[PDB]
Amino acid sequence: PGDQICIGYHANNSTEKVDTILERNVTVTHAKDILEKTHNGKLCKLNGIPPLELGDCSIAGWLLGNPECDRLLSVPEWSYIMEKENPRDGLCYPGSFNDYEELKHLLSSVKHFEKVKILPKDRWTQHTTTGGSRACAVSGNPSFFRNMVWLTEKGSNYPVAKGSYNNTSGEQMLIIWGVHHPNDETEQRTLYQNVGTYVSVGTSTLNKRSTPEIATRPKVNGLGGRMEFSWTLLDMWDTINFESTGNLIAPEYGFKISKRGSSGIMKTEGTLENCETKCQTPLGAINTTLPFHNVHPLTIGECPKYVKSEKLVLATGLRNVP
Amino acid sequence: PGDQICIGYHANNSTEKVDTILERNVTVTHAKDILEKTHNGKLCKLNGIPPLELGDCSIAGWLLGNPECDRLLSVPEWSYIMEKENPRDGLCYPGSFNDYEELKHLLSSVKHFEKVKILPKDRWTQHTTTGGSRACAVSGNPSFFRNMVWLTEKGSNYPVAKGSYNNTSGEQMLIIWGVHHPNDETEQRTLYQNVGTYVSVGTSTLNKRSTPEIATRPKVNGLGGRMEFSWTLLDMWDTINFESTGNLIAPEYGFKISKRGSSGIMKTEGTLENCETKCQTPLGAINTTLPFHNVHPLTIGECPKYVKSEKLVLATGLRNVP
Amino acid sequence: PGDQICIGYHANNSTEKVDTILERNVTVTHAKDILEKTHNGKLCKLNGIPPLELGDCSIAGWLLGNPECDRLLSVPEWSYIMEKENPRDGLCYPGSFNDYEELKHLLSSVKHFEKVKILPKDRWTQHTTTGGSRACAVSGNPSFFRNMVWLTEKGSNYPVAKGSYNNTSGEQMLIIWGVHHPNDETEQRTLYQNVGTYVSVGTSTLNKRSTPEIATRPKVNGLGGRMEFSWTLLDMWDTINFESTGNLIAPEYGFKISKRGSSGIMKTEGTLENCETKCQTPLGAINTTLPFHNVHPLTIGECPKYVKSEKLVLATGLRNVP
Amino acid sequence: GLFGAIAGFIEGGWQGMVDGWYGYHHSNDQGSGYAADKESTQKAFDGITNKVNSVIEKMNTQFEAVGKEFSNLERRLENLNKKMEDGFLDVWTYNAELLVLMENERTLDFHDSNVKNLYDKVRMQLRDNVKELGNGCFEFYHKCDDECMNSVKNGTYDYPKYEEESKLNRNE
Amino acid sequence: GLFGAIAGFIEGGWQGMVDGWYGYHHSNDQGSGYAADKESTQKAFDGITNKVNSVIEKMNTQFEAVGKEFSNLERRLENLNKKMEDGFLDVWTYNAELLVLMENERTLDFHDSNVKNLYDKVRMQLRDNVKELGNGCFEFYHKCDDECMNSVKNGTYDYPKYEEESKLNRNE
Amino acid sequence: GLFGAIAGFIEGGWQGMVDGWYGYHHSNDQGSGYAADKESTQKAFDGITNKVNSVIEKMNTQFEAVGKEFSNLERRLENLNKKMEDGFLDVWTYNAELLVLMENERTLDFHDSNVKNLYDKVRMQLRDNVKELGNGCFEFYHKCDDECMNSVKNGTYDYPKYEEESKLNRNE
Ligand SMILES: *[C@@H]1O[C@H](CO)[C@@H](O[C@@H]2O[C@H](CO)[C@@H](O)[C@H](O)[C@H]2NC(C)=O)[C@H](O)[C@H]1NC(C)=O
Ligand SMILES: *[C@@H]1O[C@H](CO)[C@@H](O[C@@H]2O[C@H](CO)[C@@H](O)[C@H](O)[C@H]2NC(C)=O)[C@H](O)[C@H]1NC(C)=O
Ligand SMILES: *[C@@H]1O[C@H](CO)[C@@H](O[C@@H]2O[C@H](CO)[C@@H](O)[C@H](O)[C@H]2NC(C)=O)[C@H](O)[C@H]1NC(C)=O
Ligand SMILES: *[C@@H]1O[C@H](CO)[C@@H](O)[C@H](O)[C@H]1NC(C)=O
Ligand SMILES: *[C@@H]1O[C@H](CO)[C@@H](O)[C@H](O)[C@H]1NC(C)=O
Ligand SMILES: *[C@@H]1O[C@H](CO)[C@@H](O)[C@H](O)[C@H]1NC(C)=O
């Protein structure tokens, strides 16, 4: 037996495991977990900008001005929009909203509106505008969508109703209008005096028209009538013209797009908490430097890449050998 | 020369070949084919449940009740639906079917209906209901879609036609109705007496209406007239109201969705054979434990993963060396 | 010291670099660049067949026959269609074109039309057909889309207008028609005498109808009126019937599909040059044997595979060692 | 191959060795014959079994085409649907084919490594009591009966035991 | 493993060697102890650092789901959207999982190669001045003090210097 | 590298060896010079040619973007189309880039393996008729003229022929 030199490798107390193609559950001296699995369970400001919390209101309830949504009558810039799965406060007067999903999609790239009084209500001097319904009641009295005007007979007459607006606002403007489809003809005559009425809307590109439909339907919010809403984006310097002999639900306001950018509607039942994040999911906010996460596919902000994986651990060291 | 020990490896009679990146057509001692390329060329029961064989009928011919489809008037639960590419027996009275592809898509998750007599024909006491056409003839006499009612003048009058149905059936219910668009005004007056008629339909969510169009068109199945069908899914506890002064094609029945699950419409010219499978393709049934197949992309049941590959053979043994 | 033999490897003057997972910027003796990064900056004939250069015309301007597009009145087979982003010459009389994007998509598989005079203008003996507008003026005089006929009052009458065409042409035929929506009722009476008019169109499968809408709109090309165009593909041996008491914009021609195949509309502001290619991009033509390119995703012809990569270099030789 | 043994310095395989992938051939006064190395064969078997399971399992979350229909006025939508379903089909065909090619390469090289490692283990045990012929064989500088051969095969060869006999034989 | 050193002929690791992945254990008259090979450790460290960065960077152009809504009469479109977003999700999950498995394999084999190459470097320097025991150790045919041990560790061993002492010891 | 030869124990390449990837340098009384090993070079060439063809061919079933247009009321559909075409683009860019990186790694290691295997073949043929210097060279214990050098290069070296001259030289 003589002097010796031996060649060898590191071992330690690590119990970190990795998988390979050939072998599973291999213990290694060093490893790097590249998958974020945690979140704070909260809805937060995104880079210090809070979301728009609709609460019990839908997108339609907000923009039309359902009186249960009055807290939303003027809202500042947002980073994302929180909407419940089945918001209670939408179309208080029942009906429909044409191309509603398209409108929601637009909202994904809008971060602020300026509401502009495009067709002030007091300028309809030839028609009654104090029209409302118990279905949109406020303090036990009939009322109506705050942003809209229900034109009805004045002094037993309904002259041809004309309004127009040139978009001088400096940005594209979202404008909504409706047509009332009555339950019966007593309703039609009491409200509009006229029969065989029409609602016409025209811009440089839109020529969308309507004849109201009178017809018995099951009651929704107590009413068999319906209001069918439609919308358009009015380009800068273009004009919208409304024309009607009955059944027009006119906008009083338009929503000028005042800020654009990546946003989104998050479906959540939760409420905003006093917290800050760069990456928001519907389950909660992520704060990580890791490249992947498995929290939720629908994220907003500066986020890691979502994968379905339960684990992603890269070996960096060598097989840890007893 | 002295005693020897030698180190070496297995060889055998295998002619199994595999490919690698560096080399092709390598012979190996052992290999595992992971690609199923065979099927039995038959359409079969899927886990003992037979498909719905439409034969020469389309989905529309079935649900409307084209008299050539009478074998389908009551059908039990199915595992998939077989439909030909161009079924002969569809709209016997020519016309159109609004959102037809959407209806077919619904059928992908429906495995059974219960047909319910929602608006019994004998209750239209103010109108003739024995209306039919040679295009839907039965035994040489004019007839009509079995599930539908063509309301016409009675005693030279057509009073306002009203029917309604509350869905108390316990599940959502598919309901179809139509509007007749006549060829000419002699037709309109002989059938409906009235002119400037309408068909209105309303539920809690649908307000879909119609004015019939009178107009010359090329003959289809001998007729220049058309019937335009529409459909809705009536929710549990909701009511549908029909209202008309002419041209309504009323449903007598609704189809309650009685079983839901993964299904599908398979396009095939073939017929069901007495065989059983867990995995059906339009070309034939697959019976394999292999993870991949290349038979057809459109499969129903518990199937391997489809790839376009002509071969997938994994080497398991070593290079087989002479 | 004695005689020696040494084992070793090639080195050379190569400065070609490749990357690996473990190392970057490795110098190798030999390498293969598999990514084409160059193009000739020109729009060219594709296999000797020139594109259809619309110039300032849109697809609609061409097919309707805007008088600014007269060079396109008869065009030979093309290999792709060049269209500008915002062509000036489209609907000279302002309006809309229903399912326009669907029509453009059809054009992706059409390589030639034969324009067929299906409803010769001189056969409308009961109506004026010399109708036109300053918005479509030619030589300072009112005119109109060359392929269309604006039927108006003759001798203060507008009798029911009927035309029909059986497609005996030997292929499917694209047919366009329109409805005029006037600005006001003076316009309607001066042009059509009649009020409460209609435009009806019917084939074996299409039953599409219209009532013109009279309504004030902002001026486009000086006009508040609109023309709303629609189209259909008329099958071989099928018949189209037009019927109107006012406001019909009739086709005089149909476009028989005379050649089919892979084509496409390329969006470009450029002009065709005297050059030949097998692979055209909007940026310029590619001439390569390399399997990948990074020039542009939207190519026409026999092309390499597009990737976003800035580099794809495969090592073929060994590490080049000093 | 990468490790230089299979179809390498060990120029051919053994039809005579039927019960394993790797092993031995011995030759002495008592006679000759074949025998598989059970440990190395089993280690490789376990690896390969794990390999096949892994390739399969990674392609269980794979796209499925779902039958849908479109109108003659929904051609763009139909084309989108077709491009998508075809697109995923092509991705997964690529994934399956590539994976199998890459892993087949590594499978052949794995067996090559296994043979080389077994060779080297025996080499490092026998040391200079044998001549390394260059063909996978070691020729003994001493007589090595069945008991001796068995000790080499289960890694218990007594180098010191034969050292003197070998050094004497080797040094003449 | 592929290169036969780690959990191979070098049967176990060293808890005693704390400041590197690979290195030495020496034993003489002056005493004994451990020491990491800094060059080989650093080369491996750089490679591994490059590896992790590469796997991450290749999956930065990865699909994102974008929230959209559909009507009750747009079920096909909704299904198309769902199939697409799920489809890319499954592709990228596959890419991430596979990449990590394949690269983990190669990472373990890389360290194995690094150990074997270090062993062979020392072997090729010491030559027949040492006995190769078969366990990662070389036993010297001469006395090799700390200075001598240090020369081996930094690749400056003087074969000729000890040649005569070794040949004399080796040849008896 | 993985096999320890290239930029390894064979520390540098040869500008002098122009007609192959791997080969020999000989030195005797008749003079000196370079010569490529044709067999090993050709085997590698065939492999590499197969490799490039495979990487290309596996990405021939690759997604193509097809130009479509959408109305201002089809923004969701337009976005779906864009997300899809971008999504496949990103998948195929990933596939191409990754494949090239992984295969480049294996290409360099393949050449390294090829050099090591050629070295070992010569080593195993020359045996103890030469000294293994540790730098890719074998120094002969006998005189080895051009004919002798040629026999080594085509694997027909006569160990027994030079055995006696070598043992005599080696043993003094
Ligand atoms: C609507 O208002 C605008 C702004 O007053 C009108 O004026 C012009 O339109 C352009 C559009 O590019 C504006 O940017 C300019 O401020 C105006 N140009 C000039 C030369 O004054 C526009 O005319 C109005 N529309 C109508 C129907 O009168
Ligand atoms: C339609 O029929 C249903 C069942 O009779 C009616 O009754 C209520 O509706 C609820 C819906 O959630 C049913 O589940 C209950 O059976 C009923 N509730 C009560 C308190 O009786 C419903 O009212 C009918 N619709 C109309 C228009 O009368
Ligand atoms: C339209 O024209 C065609 C061709 O003249 C008419 O004739 C038949 O239709 C078939 C369709 O498959 C043609 O291919 C044949 O040339 C014709 N068959 C026979 C037996 O003559 C068709 O009838 C015309 N349509 C109308 C409404 O009359
Ligand atoms: C991994 O190995 C550990 C010990 O090395 C063992 O306890 C366990 O069974 C393995 N992990 C699992 C849960 O498969
Ligand atoms: C594969 O090899 C066999 C014999 O080893 C040969 O006959 C054949 O040409 C090869 N296969 C094909 C069809 O390429
Ligand atoms: C690659 O290496 C070269 C020299 O070998 C060096 O000049 C350069 O920094 C490297 N390339 C880049 C731009 O990273």
Rounded alpha-carbon distances, angstroms, from residue B180 to B95, B96, B133, B249, D156: 9, 11, 12, 7, 97
Closest-CA distance of chain F to residue E164, Å? 11
CA atoms of E84 and D63, how far apart (whole Å) = 9
In a 13 Å sphere around the CA of D2, the CA atoms on its Cβ side amount to 25
Closest CA to D44 of D94, D99, D115: D115
In a 13 Å sphere around the CA of F168, the CA atoms on its Cβ side amount to 6
- Which residue matches tokens 């959540």? A268
Closest CA to E46 of C315, A17, C26, A12: C26
3-state helix, strand, coil in chain E (%, to 5): 55, 15, 30
DSSP string, B83-123: E-SS-SBS-SS-EEETTHHHHHHHHTTEEEEEEE--S-GGG
B192: its two tokens? 């409906």
In three-state secondary structure terms, B176 is: strand
Using a 10 angstrom Cβ sphere, with 0-12 exposed, 13-18 middle and 19 or more buried, the burial of residue F171 is exposed
A15: its two tokens? 């119990």
Rounded alpha-carbon distances, angstroms, from residue D48 to A20, B23, C24, D96: 12, 20, 32, 17
In three-state secondary structure terms, E77 is: helix
Torsion-angle region of C95 (φ positive above 0: left; ψ -120 to 50: alpha; else: beta): left
In this complex, is the C-beta atom of B10 within 8 Å of any C-beta atom belonging to chain A?
no
CB F24 within 8 A of CB F121: no
Resolution in Å equals: 1.8
CA atoms of B9 and A309, how far apart (whole Å) = 40
Domain extents for chain D? 1-172
Q: What angle do CA A141, A146, A151 make, to 5 degrees?
A: 80
CA atoms of E135 and E123, how far apart (whole Å) = 12
CB F14 within 8 A of CB C7: no
F16: its two tokens? 């002098």
- In DSSP terms, which residues pair with F31 in a beta bridge? F28
CA atoms of B23 and F50, how far apart (whole Å) = 6
Instruction: Assign domain E1-172 one CATH number from 3.90.20.10, 3.40.50.150, 3.40.50.720, 3.10.20.30.
Output: 3.90.20.10
Gap from CA of D103 to ligand 5 centroid (Å):
21
Closest CA to D121 of D143, D149, D154: D154
In this complex, is the C-beta atom of B162 within 8 Å of any C-beta atom belonging to chain A?
yes
Using a 10 angstrom Cβ sphere, with 0-12 exposed, 13-18 middle and 19 or more buried, the burial of residue B96 is middle
B306: its two tokens? 């489809």
CB D99 within 8 A of CB D55: yes
C99: its two tokens? 């399912």
DSSP state at residue B287: -
Q: What angle do CA B127, B131, B136 make, to 5 degrees?
A: 160
A170 Cβ closer than 6 Å to some ligand 1 atom? no
In this complex, is the C-beta atom of B67 within 8 Å of any C-beta atom belonging to chain A?
no
- Which residue matches tokens 């030997």? C170
Q: What are the chain D neighbours of B22 within 8 Å (beta carbons)?
A: 105
Closest CA to B285 of B305, B267, B302: B302
CA atoms of C52 and C65, how far apart (whole Å) = 15
In this complex, is the C-beta atom of B311 within 8 Å of any C-beta atom belonging to chain A?
no
C40: its two tokens? 């000739």
Indicate yes or no: CB of C21 within 8 angstroms of CB of F90: no
CA atoms of C54 and C228, how far apart (whole Å) = 22
CA atoms of F143 and B25, how far apart (whole Å) = 45
Q: What are the chain F neighbours of E66 within 8 Å (beta carbons)?
A: 79, 83
- Residues touching ligand 3 (Cβ under 6 Å) are B 218; C 166, 168, 237, 239
**Type and span of the H or E element at E32:** strand E31-36
Closest-CA distance of chain A to residue C204, Å? 28
DSSP state at residue D24: E
Helix axes A100-107, F75-126, angle to 10 degrees: 60
Closest CA to B4 of D40, D143, D170, E134: D143
Gap from CA of B178 to ligand 2 centroid (Å):
28
CA atoms of D104 and D96, how far apart (whole Å) = 12
Closest CA to E110 of F13, B316, F112, D39: F112
Within chain F, strands assigned E span 22-28, 31-36, 130-132, 137-140
CA atoms of D152 and D122, how far apart (whole Å) = 7
Burial per residue of C233-254, b for 16 or more beta-carbon CB atoms within 10 angstroms, e otherwise? bbeeebbbbbbbbbbbbbbbbb
Gap from CA of B25 to ligand 5 centroid (Å):
6
Q: What are phi and psi of B113, to 5 degrees?
A: -120, 155
**Strand F22-28 relative to strand E137-140, pairing:** unpaired
Indicate yes or no: CB of D136 within 8 angstroms of CB of B8: yes
The amino acid occupying position E139 is E
CA atoms of C50 and C268, how far apart (whole Å) = 15
Which residues are within 8 A (CB) of B27 and not within 5 positions of it... i.e. 6 or more apart? B14, B15, B16, B17, B319, B320
- Which residue matches tokens 């339609």? A60
CA atoms of B239 and A74, how far apart (whole Å) = 38
Torsion-angle region of A261 (φ positive above 0: left; ψ -120 to 50: alpha; else: beta): left
Closest-CA distance of chain C to residue E69, Å? 22
- Which residue matches tokens 């709303």? C228
CA atoms of C11 and C14, how far apart (whole Å) = 8
Rounded alpha-carbon distances, angstroms, from residue F165 to B115, D131, E163, F147, F168: 105, 19, 22, 17, 5
Closest CA to D1 of F114, A157, B304: F114
CA atoms of B216 and C242, how far apart (whole Å) = 8
D84: its two tokens? 């998508």
Q: How far is CA A14 from the centre of its chain?
A: 49
Closest CA to B199 of B185, B181, B222, B183: B181
CA atoms of D74 and B105, how far apart (whole Å) = 15
Atom 8, ligand 3: residue with shortest CA distance: C237
Torsion-angle region of C226 (φ positive above 0: left; ψ -120 to 50: alpha; else: beta): beta
- In DSSP terms, which residues pair with A116 in a beta bridge? A254
Give the alpha-carbon dihedral of A294, A300, A303, A307, to 10 degrees: 30
DSSP string, B230-285: EEEEEPTT-EEEEEESS-EEEES-EEEEEEE-S--EEE-S--EEEEEESEEETTEE
In this structure, the number of other CB atoms found within 10 A of the CB of residue D19 comes to 11
Q: How far is CA C24 from the centre of its chain?
A: 46
Closest Cβ–Cβ partner in B95, B181, B218 for C241: B218
CB C266 within 8 A of CB C82: yes
Closest CA to F88 of C283, D59, C308: C308
In a 13 Å sphere around the CA of D12, the CA atoms on its Cβ side amount to 5
Closest Cβ–Cβ partner in E64, E68, E139 for A2: E139
CB B42 within 8 A of CB B276: no
CA atoms of B286 and A198, how far apart (whole Å) = 61
Which residues are within 8 A (CB) of D133 and not within 5 positions of it... i.e. 6 or more apart? D139
Using a 10 angstrom Cβ sphere, with 0-12 exposed, 13-18 middle and 19 or more buried, the burial of residue E23 is buried
Rounded alpha-carbon distances, angstroms, from residue E17 to A11, E33, E108, E115: 8, 9, 19, 14
Indicate yes or no: CB of C241 within 8 angstroms of CB of B216: yes
A50: its two tokens? 């809070």
In three-state secondary structure terms, F15 is: coil
Indicate yes or no: CB of F80 within 8 angstroms of CB of E70: no
Using a 10 angstrom Cβ sphere, with 0-12 exposed, 13-18 middle and 19 or more buried, the burial of residue A85 is exposed
Which residues are within 8 A (CB) of A123 and not within 5 positions of it... i.e. 6 or more apart? A163
- What are the structural domains of chain A? 1-49+271-322 (2.10.77.10), 50-270 (3.90.209.20)
The amino acid occupying position F120 is D
In this complex, is the C-beta atom of D128 within 8 Å of any C-beta atom belonging to chain F?
no
In three-state secondary structure terms, F22 is: strand
CA atoms of E170 and E142, how far apart (whole Å) = 9
B12: its two tokens? 């055998």
Which chains have 3 or more CB–CB distances shorter than 8 Å to chain C? A, B, D, E, F
CA atoms of C314 and C301, how far apart (whole Å) = 26
- In DSSP terms, which residues pair with F137 in a beta bridge? C6
CB B179 within 8 A of CB B228: yes
CB A225 within 8 A of CB A263: no
3-state secondary structure chain C: CCCEEEEEEECCCCCCEECCCCCCCEEECCEEECEECCCCCCEEEECCECCEECCCECHHHHHHCCHHHHHHCCCCCCCCEEECCCCCECCCCCEEECCHHHHHHHHCCEEEEEEECCCCHHHCCCCECCCCEEEEEECCEEECCCCEEECECECCECCCEEEEEECCCCCCEEEEEEEEECCCHHHHHHHHCCCCCCEEEECCCCEEEECCCCCCCCCECCECCEEEEEEEEECCCCEEEEEECCCEEEECCEEEEEEECCCCEEECCCCEEEEEECEEECCEEECCCCCEECCCCCCEECCCEECCCCCCEEECCCECCC
A126 Cβ closer than 6 Å to some ligand 1 atom? no
CB F6 within 8 A of CB F111: yes
CB D97 within 8 A of CB B314: no
CA atoms of C55 and B121, how far apart (whole Å) = 62
Using a 10 angstrom Cβ sphere, with 0-12 exposed, 13-18 middle and 19 or more buried, the burial of residue B226 is buried
Closest CA to B272 of B26, B44, B83: B44
3-state secondary structure chain A: CCCEEEEEEECCCCCCEECCCCCCCEEECCEEECEECCCCCCEEEECCECCEECCCECHHHHHHCCHHHHHHCCCCCCCCEEECCCCCECCCCCEEECCHHHHHHHHCCEEEEEEECCCCHHHCCCCECCCCEEEEEECCEEECCCCEEECECECCECCCEEEEEECCCCCCEEEEEEEEECCCHHHHHHHHCCCCCCEEEECCCCEEEECCCCCCCCCECCECCEEEEEEEEECCCCEEEEEECCCEEEECCEEEEEEECCCCEEECCCCEEEEEECEEECCEEECCCCCEECCCCCCEECCCEECCCCCCEEECCCECCC
Closest CA to A143 of A69, A87, A213: A69
CA atoms of C105 and F66, how far apart (whole Å) = 10
Q: Is the Cα torsion angle C53, C58, C60, C61 positive or negative in sign?
A: negative
D8: its two tokens? 């390498």
Q: Is the Cα torsion angle F144, F149, F151, F157 positive or negative in sign?
A: positive
In three-state secondary structure terms, D142 is: coil
In three-state secondary structure terms, B16 is: coil
By what technique were these coordinates determined?
X-ray
The amino acid occupying position C149 is V
CB E103 within 8 A of CB E55: yes
Which residues are within 8 A (CB) of A107 and not within 5 positions of it... i.e. 6 or more apart? A59, A81, A263, A265
CA atoms of B235 and B258, how far apart (whole Å) = 13
CB C38 within 8 A of CB C52: no
Mutation target among D73, D76, D119 for the F interface, most CBs of F within 10 A: D76
Q: What are phi and psi of F166, to 5 degrees?
A: -70, -50
